[PDB]
Design an enzyme around this catalytic site. Structure first.
Site, PDB file in Angstrom:
ATOM      1  CB  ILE A  85      -0.901  -0.001   1.246  1.00 48.64           C
ATOM      2  CG1 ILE A  85      -1.910  -1.148   1.137  1.00 48.64           C
ATOM      3  CG2 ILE A  85      -1.620   1.333   1.380  1.00 48.64           C
ATOM      4  CD1 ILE A  85      -2.711  -1.369   2.378  1.00 48.64           C
ATOM      5  CD  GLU A  93       8.052  14.769  -0.343  1.00 48.25           C
ATOM      6  OE1 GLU A  93       7.664  15.230   0.753  1.00 48.25           O
ATOM      7  OE2 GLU A  93       9.002  15.258  -0.979  1.00 48.25           O
TER       8      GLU A  93
END
Ligand SMILES: CC(C)(C)c1ccc(C(=O)N/N=C/c2cc(Br)c(O)c(Br)c2O)cc1
Ligand SMILES: CC(C)(C)c1ccc(C(=O)N/N=C/c2cc(Br)c(O)c(Br)c2O)cc1
Ligand SMILES: [Cl-]
Ligand SMILES: [Cl-]
Ligand SMILES: [Cl-]
Ligand SMILES: [Cl-]
Ligand SMILES: [Cl-]
Ligand SMILES: [Cl-]
Lengths: 149, 152, 151, 149, 151, 152
Positions: free
Chosen positions: E56, E64
């Site tokens: 995941i 980010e």
């Protein structure tokens, strides 16, 4: 006397990137071992040791000798026993008389030569050299203790 | 001539890089006499994938390596001070290692502090010795002689 | 339950592994209330190869991740205590993040300390908030909500 | 005719973890080249190929043969010239008639034996084998192209 | 001026492996918005630890990636594609707000970042938008950054 | 039995693991016939550090590896269906590779689609062939024979 990576993986707890023994060519219980690790550029360590000048770390040569020595000690007492291997830890207490004579680089077959200098109970003292193409590249003495994992 | 150096200064003096730069900061430095530095130990380090699975222990040999790099920084700076230009032309090499003793295992969460003292130095040849400590306790001891050679 | 846990304990509770387990030790733990933990920052971390070259700076988003992991550890031990068997029948996932501020850059040599308090918690849904500190100074603040789920 | 990793680094554009040739033992312009790569357990690829059973990927054996061919091509074209080299990269064009006979594993010295089948400009066609301890572990033919970065 | 590939991204952003999380820019309107994306593959180191047997993409890394997209937008809005000036600038991300994760991101997904300039006052840039996979919103976030001189 | 499989299903069938599991998802699957799968290519992959610095190009040989792994998934499921417990102790060996041709470089941002068709199979030996595609275009073509075997 010949143990391959598969056999080694069953005795030593070390895994990537800290298992520094690829194959065992000679083993004499309570006496000596000859094993080696191939050095290749394709190892993470070379990214930093050093940029533009690949040199296998001297301390890792010692680590490789220690692992060979531990393999010797464990096997001398219990032979090739994966089961019992999981119930023991071979940790190193001391290291002494270490000398580095020649730099080890990619393409070298780093051969470990250790013999039992002395042993009493679970305390084993091994010593010997690290060699490339018949030349002594390093030497060291180590003392290890065998205990219950 | 400074006593404190951070990773940015260390990178300019030592040639070591990831994953073999094992000194994060220098807290004390006394030319030709001693150095105190440290390396933080964290689980987020590749070495722990193999040393050992489910039992992260910082390799004793790397503790020694860190001690040597500290001594090496001390050796160089003792001779040229903080000089990056010249640092790029020199490299320190391990000649010998003696009296190494590992007393306590180093694990993630630990602040591995290096304490090196100059036992003898003549030109490019430096003999240092000291300990590696965690929260005031000695986890390792070692002596080593290094050589300051040409990078080429 | 104890108030201090080491990496060996954290591995037994959190599902995160390398290179995403960003909490090294737990120093203070008060069930359903708060937790103080930390992660040592060292140059010897892969992250630094790219963030950034010649200038190592611990990614702000990873500081938040670390705070979340601390929160998750608090959440789980609050509801099941130190239970490795139940723990591995779980995972925790971020639901939201809010009010995060990055005041001071975190670099190699720093001891990144996490301070989280439970703002709200209902079943598997926990809302924590707090700061990340280095030598007693706030380097970051954040609020996050997470959930512990099955497999 | 005896090139080491630092020489190889100045000619081939490949870097970690895709530089699979550690040393050149023989070189004869427009004729052949013999080189090798040490295989050690301490290589990241083994974490996934395969878990608990380290086998050097067959495709990487071919890649290593291609790189060997590349070095032969660069030198045959411009001699040992690091300056020209630095502007280029190498592209695989074709691969054919490859057969793997024996698995390569940690501890093996993987030796590349490539000869020139045909060449013209930047396009080189080579073929040969990969051997371990004098035994053929693989066969292959391949065509590559040298280009401006 | 509109489409930038990995070569171009590398010349503007200082980020490198393993923290360069934007593979290609498919749309860019100076001072307005940016659409870009990062391919998610299992062959990424982060998946070794997030999580074993259950890959995941970390939610914080989505943020980010969004931050990076915002930064490329801000930079290109000010100086266009200028690698030379890029080497002398930095964008500090000061805050992150109102982030919400709706759908998990996994190997095989094409994570698309959709950022828009919310406000620009001096050296301060406030961007916001979403991360999408196959047309569906998987994450939301607001971020404020500062443009500064490298050093 | 199914035709679409996600990374979790792939992990239960193929023995490959990081950094050598090069298939992210299966979109089509016809037992003993064909398979269509793909791997996303991103800059955030370790191979790119060395192939090549400043010029990211997904290694051609890894494209072939990806096709082989696609065939392998097809081979195994055609044999025992979706059976993880059986797959757990199998590995795959490359036997041969022929008529491989690369036409277009694969780079970060590309969705590398593998299209494999069974040319001939017998027991554990599968002779598979096909192409690799990016945005509907043929980026590579290859023929390969792999053997499924039990870890011994
Ligand atoms: C020499 C000294 C005192 C520093 C030392 C002591 C113990 C150890 C040690 O515990 N080594 N290995 C321990 C260990 C390894 C695995 Br595998 C394991 O599953 C468990 Br339980 C261990 O304690 C290392 C160094
Ligand atoms: C290593 C160097 C000088 C390139 C560097 C140093 C610091 C930083 C920093 O602390 N933050 N941000 C850099 C940065 C620059 C641009 Br242009 C950008 O779009 C984004 Br987003 C950034 O994070 C970045 C790069
Ligand atoms: Cl060394
Ligand atoms: Cl150790
Ligand atoms: Cl940051
Ligand atoms: Cl293979
Ligand atoms: Cl997440
Ligand atoms: Cl290629």
């Amino acid at each position: 006397s010949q143990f391959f990576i598969e056999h080694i993986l069953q005795i030593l707890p070390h895994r990537y990137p800290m298992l520094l023994v690829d194959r065992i060519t000679e083993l004499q219980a309570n006496q000596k071992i000859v094993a080696y690790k191939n050095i290749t550029f394709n190892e993470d360590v070379f990214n930093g040791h050093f940029p533009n000048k690949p040199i296998f770390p001297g301390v890792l040569i010692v680590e490789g000798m220690a692992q060979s020595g531990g393999f010797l000690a464990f096997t001398s007492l219990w032979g090739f026993d994966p089961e019992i291997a999981k119930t023991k830890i071979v940790y190193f207490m001391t290291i002494d008389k270490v000398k580095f004579r020649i730099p080890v680089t990619p393409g070298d077959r780093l051969e470990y030569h250790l013999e039992v200098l002395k042993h009493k109970g679970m305390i084993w003292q091994v010593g010997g050299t690290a060699q490339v193409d018949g030349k002594v590249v390093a030497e060291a003495e180590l003392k290890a203790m065998i205990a219950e994992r």
